[PDB]
């Protein structure tokens, strides 16, 4: 706010000898007008009133750049330019200890998001919303974009402990992705051979899908190593915890990085946590069958395949996938919009 | 017991899967057609113009209000109140306005219309409190059907899509878009927040992004449009084709009034402005402010300062809050650059 | 026609759309008896509008309005 | 001895061999509201020992 | 210089941080509060009797840093060196890749500052020089 302004304006009272009759206006004293007003500072009109001359303050600028809406103005356009950059170069991000506003959408547009222990990730304020909700429902902003409500609503993609093992998974990420369009495949030799067999084998009866992805240890005589597809240990997860029908990600075969999917087959069984402001919201908890397409899974699904549509990759997809679930309530929220969206990619 | 409890217009147009529903074979053609008659006959077309009969050099009657309204009438008009069956003009051309995906998400209402003969898609804003009824799944026994009030002037994750989706199925037809934006902000609830509206707004960006037509966005009175509203449709992210005008009576910031007074109106505020405009406390001030004062006399005037002050805030409060206001006015944003030039509707 | 004109407004100038017109003049003159040499009309007008886009929304510009026209 | 390009820090002299190099450790000067933060050890010289110069330069400065 | 009979007074003044890394900031000193003129160098041009930075600066962004539960952002650079040190030893478990960089050689930053019309502008300079 003008500062100028608040430690020597006056109020205009509907009656001065009572201010609790309400005010009509602030104004400025002679000395004090006379100096904002020539300044182009705010916007006044000459006015006489209760028989003093005034410079009545009709309108606020504020010779102080920057408090107004150019800030607002401001967020939009670093917002547009990393969205369609987005879709046209490699963007990542780690939140640390907490992203507001416009820092909270911009590291939420470029979509790839990592977040650091006791930070949040929110728009808003707990306080104003506990407010305009009438009582202190929510104590800290942890719980409005804390991972306990962005890491089970799939909003957070990672999650990390502090910013250093972030740089280590924004460095560690980097190591997938070719440097620019100009380049190659450029490939590694890989210490998980390519001409090998796999000893693992999917199974009828259900399995972790990592396996099948990633290998596994030898069940019994450690330490000897079911193969798996892809290389040891090559593989880099996203959206983890959340829909869990299908997995999505990336790795390594032989050296060359790509994006991976595999599907769950146990039916999977999601939270759904209680609302605290609403009375009625209990913390209910979804059956969400394994090889099935959902709302939730489709928008996740088509969000990998389609980062690394716009990067350039190969794919190599293991797809199994028997159709959509078509209960009511799943039906009316919307997985047709979404199927369709994913045939764009 | 039926396909249309999956499929039926009363899933598809209660989740605004489907934008029209029709009675009748005869009926629904007659309904395809009819939109056809806003559209470009190919890419290479213009919008087919109409000479409306709804005149262009009119005045609109209808003024959106404080009170709570359909949007259709600050939009498409209304009958006239006393004279009937006189018509309370609208923005756009009397019966103009086709909207789609009605029952869904009606905190916003979105559709085509004509202006003048012009066909645009328009989106504006409910006023009223929402009742937006989601069905209960007879699949599972717990489900019962919540009935949830869902606020006006609010992006919830349901309005941002209706919101999302009308734009970006508008932008692709080749219609210039004219939002009568009244939004406070998107909602920052656990829930509506849980349920993505976030993710939305930053898609919306890159829908808007693909516009190759006028645009034109006109805040009406009684109307605010504060953070992730305008932030997300700021003429950044298109500057090419994006033009922007706001009505005297349009609001602008981060954060709206009542949020921003909490931080810069403390007691200190209140007491500074109190001593420099408040009668009584200047009085109280020059005893307090007088040395050599009586045991009696000085108690009582700490216990006068006291009691004189938090007395005195309710009235300085309101003060206070209307000094804020004032910075964030349409007056302020031309001159900052945020808006082209004020209209008044 | 260049020099005369510009000689008589060299003040009042804003130099960012003044060095990017005063350099090709001087190069209108350093490439000058060429066969093929005509004035790069729509270059000076549009660079003088990159800066348009950015101030134009603000009536800020009657200094600049009588080095814009 | 720009020396007064760090009156705000503290430096006492202790007489040396090698006469020359005066070295400081410094404290850092600050208001008798405040403790000093910066602990540095400074090694000050003059070079004065009469192409071999820069050599001489270099290799007296091992030395040294 | 061997002809010309110019003598020319040069405040070098030398840079290393951790690691062998050496940054030798050259100047001449040149014309009225002396200039340390040369690239872009940290503290390119400044006059000489500069008083000596405090450290405690550093330190105080450092604290505030902390108790936000991060990272301070002139710590980044090595930050990012030690996850990438990190990197490359971890790396080599799962693919054969060349020899990793010694610490002083890993990255190397500039700083990118904006100019009046919001253009780049590149600047080598000391940790701790945010506006």
């Not at chain 1, 620019?180 to 450029?186: G, I």
């Not at chain 2, 309204?69 to 086709?98: I, V």
């Not at chain 4, 600050?30 to 290799?59: C, K, P, W």
Request: a negative charge; aromatic letters at 10%; hydrophobic letters at 40%.
């Amino acid at each position: 706010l003008a500062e100028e302004i608040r430690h020597m304006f006056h109020v205009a009272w509907v009656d001065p000898e009572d201010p609790y009759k309400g005010y009509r206006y602030l104004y400025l004293t002679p000395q004090d007008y006379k100096r904002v007003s020539a300044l182009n500072s705010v916007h006044c009109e000459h006015v006489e009133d209760e028989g003093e001359s005034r410079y009545k303050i009709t309108d606020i600028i504020g010779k102080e750049e920057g408090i107004g809406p150019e800030n607002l103005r401001g967020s939009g356009m670093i917002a547009g330019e990393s969205s369609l950059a987005y879709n046209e170069i490699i963007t990542i991000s780690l939140v640390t200890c907490r992203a507001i506003g416009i820092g909270a959408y911009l590291v939420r547009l470029g979509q790839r998001t990592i977040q650091v222990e006791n930070s949040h990730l929110i728009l808003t304020g707990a306080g104003a919303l506990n407010k305009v909700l009438g009582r202190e429902v929510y104590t800290s902003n942890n719980q409005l974009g804390g991972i306990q409500i962005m890491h089970n609503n799939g909003v957070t993609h990672c999650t990390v402990c502090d910013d250093f093992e972030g740089v280590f998974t924004v460095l560690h990420w980097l190591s997938y992705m070719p440097k620019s369009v100009h380049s190659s495949v450029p490939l590694l030799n890989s210490k998980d051979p390519i001409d090998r067999i796999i000893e693992f084998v999917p199974t009828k009866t259900p399995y972790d899908p990592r396996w099948m992805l990633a290998g596994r240890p030898h069940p019994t005589q450690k330490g000897q190593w079911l193969s798996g597809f892809f290389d040891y240990g090559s593989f880099s997860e996203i959206m983890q915890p959340w829909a869990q029908t299908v997995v999505v990600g990336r790795a390594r075969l032989g050296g060359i990085p790509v994006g991976v999917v595999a599907v769950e087959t146990r039916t999977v069984e999601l939270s759904i946590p209680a609302d605290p402001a609403n009375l009625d919201s209990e913390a209910k908890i979804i059956q969400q069958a394994g090889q099935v397409w959902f709302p939730d899974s489709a928008f996740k699904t088509y969000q990998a395949i389609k980062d690394f549509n716009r990067e350039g990759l190969p794919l190599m997809v293991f797809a199994n996938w028997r159709g959509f679930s078509g209960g009511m309530k799943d039906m009316y929220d919307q997985v047709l919009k979404f199927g369709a969206y994913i045939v764009d990619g | 017991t039926s396909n249309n409890q999956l499929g039926g217009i009363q899933i598809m147009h209660n989740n605004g899967v489907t934008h029209c529903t029709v009675c009748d074979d005869f009926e629904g053609v007659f309904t395809v057609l009819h939109w056809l008659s806003y559209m470009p006959k190919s890419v290479h077309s213009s919008v087919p113009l109409l000479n409306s009969k709804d005149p262009i050099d009119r005045i609109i009657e209808f003024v959106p209000t404080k009170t709570p309204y359909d949007p259709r009438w600050m939009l498409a008009g209304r009958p006239h109140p006393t004279q009937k069956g006189q018509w309370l003009s609208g923005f756009f051309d009397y019966g103009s306005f086709s909207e789609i995906m009605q029952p869904w998400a009606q905190t916003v209402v979105v559709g085509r219309a004509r202006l003048g003969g012009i066909p645009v898609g328009v989106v504006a804003v409910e006023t009223r409190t929402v009742e937006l009824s989601i069905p209960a799944d007879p699949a599972n026994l717990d489900s019962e059907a919540k009935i949830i009030q869902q606020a006006g002037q609010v992006w919830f994750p349901d309005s941002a899509f209706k919101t999302y989706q009308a734009i970006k199925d508008f932008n692709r037809e080749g219609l210039p878009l004219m939002v009568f934006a009244n939004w406070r902000g998107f909602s920052g609830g656990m829930k509506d927040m849980y349920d993505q509206v976030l993710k939305f707004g930053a898609y919306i960006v890159d829908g808007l992004r693909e516009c190759c037509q006028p645009v034109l966005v006109y805040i009406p009175p009684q109307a605010e449009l504060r953070g992730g509203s305008w932030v997300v449709i700021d003429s950044s992210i298109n500057p090419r084709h994006m033009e922007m005008y706001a009505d005297r009576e349009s609001r602008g910031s981060v954060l709206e009034p009542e949020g921003t007074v909490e931080i810069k109106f403390r007691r200190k505020d209140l007491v500074k402005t109190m001593r420099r405009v408040d009668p009584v406390y200047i009085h109280l001030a020059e005893r307090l402010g007088t040395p050599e004062l009586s045991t009696a006399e000085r108690k009582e005037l700490e216990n006068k300062l006291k009691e004189r002050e938090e007395f005195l805030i309710p009235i300085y409060h309101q003060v206070a809050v209307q000094f804020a206001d004032l910075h964030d006015t349409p007056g302020r944003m031309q001159e900052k650059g945020v808006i082209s030039d004020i209209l008044d509707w | 026609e260049l020099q005369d004109i510009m000689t008589s407004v060299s003040g009042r100038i804003p130099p960012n759309v003044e060095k990017s017109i005063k350099k090709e003049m001087a190069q209108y003159a350093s490439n000058i008896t060429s066969v093929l040499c005509q004035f790069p009309s729509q270059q000076i007008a549009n660079i003088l509008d990159s800066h348009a886009a950015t101030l134009n929304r603000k009536s800020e510009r009657e200094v600049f309005f009588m080095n814009t026209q | 001895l720009e020396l007064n390009r760090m009156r705000n820090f503290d430096l006492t002299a202790i007489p040396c061999a090698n006469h020359k190099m005066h070295l400081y450790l410094g404290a850092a000067k600050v208001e008798v509201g405040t403790e000093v933060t910066d602990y540095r050890f400074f090694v000050r010289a003059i070079i004065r020992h009469s192409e071999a110069s820069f050599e001489y330069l270099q290799n007296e400065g091992e030395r040294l | 210089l061997t002809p010309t009979g110019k003598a020319i007074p040069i405040r070098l003044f030398l840079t290393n941080e951790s690691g062998y890394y050496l940054d030798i900031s050259l100047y001449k000193e040149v014309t009225a509060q002396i200039m340390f003129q040369a690239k872009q160098g940290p503290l390119h041009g400044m006059l000489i009797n500069t008083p000596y930075v405090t450290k405690d600066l550093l330190q105080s962004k450092r604290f505030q840093a902390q108790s936000l539960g991060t990272t301070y952002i002139y710590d980044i650079p090595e930050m990012f060196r030690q996850s990438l040190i990190k990197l490359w030893e971890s790396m080599s478990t799962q693919a054969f890749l060349p020899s990793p960089p010694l610490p002083s050689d890993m990255l190397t930053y500039t700083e990118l500052v904006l100019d009046d019309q919001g253009q780049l502008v590149h600047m080598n300079r000391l940790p701790g020089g945010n506006e």
